[PDB]
RNA sequence: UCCUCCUAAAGAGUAACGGAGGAGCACGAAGGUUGGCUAAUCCUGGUCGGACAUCAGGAGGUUAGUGCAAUGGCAUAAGCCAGCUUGACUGCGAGCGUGACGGCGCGAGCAGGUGCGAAAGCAGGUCAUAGUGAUCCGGUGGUUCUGAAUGGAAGGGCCAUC
């Protein structure tokens, strides 16, 4: 359950998810999962995907998480009228743009890497693709 | 427990570069000194910049710190 | 019946040559220690009634 | 607002006076500033008073 | 640093004279050969200079860099400025305390016609 | 009610029971001027003394400080120290900013009389932006301005102030 520590402000504006991803290349491992769609990932989804791969690889190799939530999201309690101030913070999400690399991995065969990432992508709400580290 | 705010102070540049002004007219309203007084320009107690002579106002960057200056040339 | 002048208005506005009105400034009665001399000095002379509220003044004192 | 208001009376016979504030708790002694009196058009000593 | 402290000391005065826009008499002092210069308001040209470094003025005083030297230079700048035409100037300490040689130079200059 | 930031879409302004914080002061000095000075944090040596007192040197260049929340500004320092002082002065005020208005703000310069400096010069409160309340009624001091037959006075007016 990734979450920041002592953030400057409890609440922040909704904002927008326009634009294009920055971390579009593999930088740590040899294989990675790239985001094709656009959306937001909650902390729970990131944890679920991480657990799926660790089990798949059987604690062999290394796992890199290239996304952090660092964005609180509020939700009004049930049977509450509009207004009366901003809602309380419930969960943290990370905004994902197309081309963003979600997870990176190294130290395992390419064949075993594909199934591990496929299992993780099955527990994410955004279209994803498998990429390999490029030479320069 | 929010909901408080202060009336806007309508700061900013009142006269822009290349337009003639009369002596004593306000050129820039500012909290600090974003622009420093140059030639024929005076600085008020609240860091307001006003024209001390009649002429055209121009902006420039001078000094080792590249700080902005406002001057007036008699044209 | 003839119109009745608003007596309160007649004690605060005086008509001038060109139809204007002069009035005393309204911040020089009390609580004067904390005020700068510059602000008190500028409030001493009489001032002309603004255009927006001139129409209101005309109705109040139609005779004077 | 512990600070309270006082009156500075010119040492000359003129009735002109200045008004200011002071804190009696910290500085209980009198105030003897030298200010300008326009009635006589001279700088004279002004004494604190009610 | 002695120079850095001196420049920092005189910066405010130099800026004040610069914006005022007036000819300024600037004096530079060292353990020997006290200098003096007159600068136009723009600060780009020197109207006239004098000092004890040249033989024309160093051939009389016993030693350069004393009270007598300051008076000679202070006097020397005077008639030169009067001959040139400029009368009113602004004295610049240049970060030097206005106590000894600097004061002597200024005193000689003011009594010699360059009132300021 | 007032102040600072964001929302606010690179002039100004701009709403919500939108998101964050403050004010109802203080100071005869913490004001004016003249002269001088330049931090935080680290490294090394050194009694108590210890990670953290004070001393010396070095890196550092303002992450310090700026009476009070925040923003902008501040080395010519607006930051720190000392001498002398009351310009925290009176009558004005070209010309501008800001408001529907009441009003609020900035201001060169002129006259009078002052302080600091050899002098040029600076000073009409405080680094700026909150620290505030119209009118009525009444109190205090000055001023033959008026004072209902006359001379006074009462009461009004004007000025300062509560």
The CB density around residue C61, as the number of other CB atoms within 10 Å, is: 19
The structure tokens 């700068």 sit at C36
Characterise E21 by phi-psi region: left (phi > 0), alpha (psi -120 to 50), beta (else).
Answer: left
β-strand partners of E39: E24, E46
The CB density around residue E116, as the number of other CB atoms within 10 Å, is: 13
The angle subtended at Cα D41 by Cα D35 and Cα D44, nearest 5°, is 35
The structure tokens 């769609």 sit at A37
CA distance A55 to A52: 5
**Structure resolution in Å?**
2.4
CA distance A39 to A125: 8
The CB density around residue E48, as the number of other CB atoms within 10 Å, is: 16
CA distance A41 to A101: 13
**The domain at D1-50 falls in which architecture?**
Single Sheet (2.20)
Q: Answer yes or no: are the C-beta atoms of B70 and B28 closer than 8 Å.
A: yes
CA distance D2 to C60: 45
CA distance A108 to D11: 98
Residue (of B23, B11, B13) closest to B74 by Cα position: B23
Q: How many residues are present in chain C?
A: 64
CA distance B38 to B60: 9
The CB density around residue B16, as the number of other CB atoms within 10 Å, is: 11
**Coil vs helix vs strand at E108:** helix
C33: chain D residues, CB-CB within 8 Å: 5, 19-21
Q: Answer yes or no: are the C-beta atoms of C49 and C23 closer than 8 Å.
A: yes
Pick E1-116's CATH classification: 1.10.1740.10, 3.30.499.10, 3.30.420.100, 3.40.50.720: 3.30.420.100
CA distance E116 to A43: 77
Residue (of A36, A69, A58) closest to A105 by Cα position: A58
Q: Which residues of C touch D (CB under 8 A)?
A: 32-33
Residue (of C33, C34, C35, C11) closest to C23 by Cα position: C11
Closest CA to the C1' of F142: that residue is D15
β-strand partners of C15: C21
For A72-78, which contacts have Cβ atoms below 8 Å and span 24 or more sequence positions? A72/A7, A72/A10, A72/A11, A72/A12, A74/A11
Q: Answer yes or no: are the C-beta atoms of A2 and A92 closer than 8 Å.
A: yes
CA distance E51 to E31: 13
Residue (of A22, A34, A2) closest to A105 by Cα position: A34
Q: How far is the CA of A94 from the C1' of F57 (A)?
A: 51
Please indicate if any CB of chain C lies within 8 Å of the CB of D19: yes
Q: Answer yes or no: are the C-beta atoms of A103 and A49 closer than 8 Å.
A: yes
- Nearest nucleotide (C1') to alpha carbon of D9: F141
Cβ-in-10-Å burial (0-12, 13-18, 19+) of D48 comes to middle
The CB density around residue A100, as the number of other CB atoms within 10 Å, is: 24
β-strand partners of E91: E25
**Coil vs helix vs strand at E12:** helix
The CB density around residue E40, as the number of other CB atoms within 10 Å, is: 14
Which superfamily does CATH assign the domain made up of A21-136 to?
Ribosomal protein L16/L10 (3.90.1170.10)
Please give the order of strands across the beta sheet that includes B67-73: B20-21, B55-62, B67-73, B35-37
The structure tokens 């804190």 sit at D23
**Domain residue spans of chain A:** 21-136
Residue (of A4, A6, A26) closest to A94 by Cα position: A4
**Domain residue spans of chain D:** 1-50
The structure tokens 């600060």 sit at E43
Strands E24-28 and E90-92: parallel
Which residues lie closer than 8 Å to D20 by C-beta, 6 or more apart?
Answer: C33, D5, D6, D8, D31
Angstrom distances, CA of residue C51 to CA of C45, C54, C63? 19, 5, 19
Q: How far is the CA of B30 from the C1' of F159 (A)?
A: 38
Cβ-in-10-Å burial (0-12, 13-18, 19+) of E72 comes to buried
CA distance B37 to B43: 6
Burial D3-42 (b: 16+ CB within 10 A, else e): eeebebbbeeeeebebeeebeeeeeeeeeeeeeebeeeee
Largest Cα–Cα distance in chain D?
35
Strand F contact nucleotides, protein CB < 7 Å: 2-8, 11-22, 24-29, 35-38, 71-78, 85-108, 112-114, 118-121, 124-129, 131-138, 141-143, 158-162
The structure tokens 């930088």 sit at A27
Q: Answer yes or no: are the C-beta atoms of A105 and A52 closer than 8 Å.
A: no
**Domain residue spans of chain B:** 11-75
Q: Answer yes or no: are the C-beta atoms of A23 and A86 closer than 8 Å.
A: no
Which residues lie closer than 8 Å to C12 by C-beta, 6 or more apart?
Answer: C23, C24
Element (H, E) at E67: helix E67-84
Joined tokens for residue D33:
């500033």
Characterise A19 by phi-psi region: left (phi > 0), alpha (psi -120 to 50), beta (else).
Answer: left
Q: Answer yes or no: are the C-beta atoms of B15 and B71 closer than 8 Å.
A: no
CA distance E15 to E89: 15
CA distance A128 to A118: 9
Q: How far is the CA of C29 from the C1' of F155 (A)?
A: 21
Angstrom distances, CA of residue A30 to CA of A96, A108, C59, E96? 21, 9, 88, 69
In angstroms, the first-to-last Cα distance of chain C is 17
D19: chain C residues, CB-CB within 8 Å: 32-33
Please indicate if any CB of chain C lies within 8 Å of the CB of D20: yes
For chain A, the DSSP string reads ----SS-S-S--------S--S--S--SSSEEEEE-S-EEEEHHHHHHHHHHHHHHHTS-SEEEE------EEE-PPSS--S-SSPPPEEEEEEEE-TT-EEEEEESS-HHHHHHHHHHHHTTSSS-EEEEE----
CA distance E103 to E116: 13
Joined tokens for residue A37:
């769609």
CA distance E27 to E98: 11
The structure tokens 């033989």 sit at E55
CA distance B52 to B70: 12
CA distance B27 to B70: 9
Residue (of A129, A124, A128, A100) closest to A42 by Cα position: A124
Query: Mutating which of C33, C34, C35 best tests the D interface, going by the most D Cβ atoms within 10 A?
Result: C33
């Amino acid at each position: 359950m990734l979450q920041p520590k002592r953030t400057k402000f409890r609440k922040m504006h909704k904002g927008r998810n326009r634009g294009l991803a920055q971390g579009t290349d593999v930088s740590f491992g040899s294989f990675g999962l790239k985001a094709v769609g656009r959306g937001r990932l909650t902390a729970r989804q990131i944890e679920a995907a991480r657990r799926a791969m660790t089990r798949a690889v059987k604690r062999q190799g290394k796992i890199w998480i290239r996304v952090f939530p660092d964005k609180p999201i509020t939700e009004k309690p049930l049977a509450v009228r509009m207004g009366k101030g901003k809602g309380n913070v419930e969960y943290w999400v990370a905004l994902i743009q197309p081309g963003k690399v979600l997870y990176e991995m190294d130290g395992v065969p390419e064949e075993l890497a594909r199934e591990a990432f496929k299992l993780a992508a099955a527990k994410l709400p955004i279209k994803t693709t498998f990429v390999t580290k490029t030479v320069m | 427990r929010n909901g408080r705010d202060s009336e806007a102070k309508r700061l900013g540049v009142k006269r822009f570069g290349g337009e003639s002004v009369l002596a004593g007219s306000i050129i820039v309203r500012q909290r600090g000194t974003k622009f420093h007084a140059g030639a024929n320009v005076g600085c008020g107690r609240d860091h307001t910049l006003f024209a001390k002579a009649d002429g055209k106002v121009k902006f420039e960057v001078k000094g080792p710190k590249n700080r902005k200056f406002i001057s007036i040339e008699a044209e | 019946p003839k119109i009745k002048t608003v007596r309160g208005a007649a004690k605060r506005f005086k008509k001038t040559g060109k139809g204007g009105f002069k009035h005393k400034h309204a911040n020089l009665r009390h609580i004067l220690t904390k005020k700068a001399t510059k602000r008190k000095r500028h409030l001493r002379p009489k001032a002309m009634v603004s255009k927006g509220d001139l129409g209101l003044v005309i109705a109040c004192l139609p005779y004077a | 607002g512990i600070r309270e208001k006082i009156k500075l009376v010119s040492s000359a016979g003129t009735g002109h006076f200045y008004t200011t504030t002071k804190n009696k708790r910290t500085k209980p002694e009198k105030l003897e500033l030298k200010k300008f009196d326009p009635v006589v058009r001279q700088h004279v000593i002004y004494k604190e008073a009610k | 640093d002695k120079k850095s402290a001196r420049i920092r000391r005189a910066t405010r005065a130099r800026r004040k004279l610069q914006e005022l826009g007036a000819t300024r008499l600037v004096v530079h002092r060292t353990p020997r050969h006290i200098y003096a210069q007159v600068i136009a308001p723009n600060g780009s040209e020197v109207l006239v200079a004098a000092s004890t470094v040249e033989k024309a003025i160093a051939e009389q005083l016993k030693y350069t860099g004393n009270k007598d030297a300051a008076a000679a230079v202070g006097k020397a700048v005077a008639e030169r400025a009067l001959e040139k035409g400029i009368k009113d100037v602004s004295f610049d300490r240049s970060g030097f305390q206005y106590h000894g040689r600097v004061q002597a130079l200024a005193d000689a200059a003011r009594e010699a016609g360059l009132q300021f």
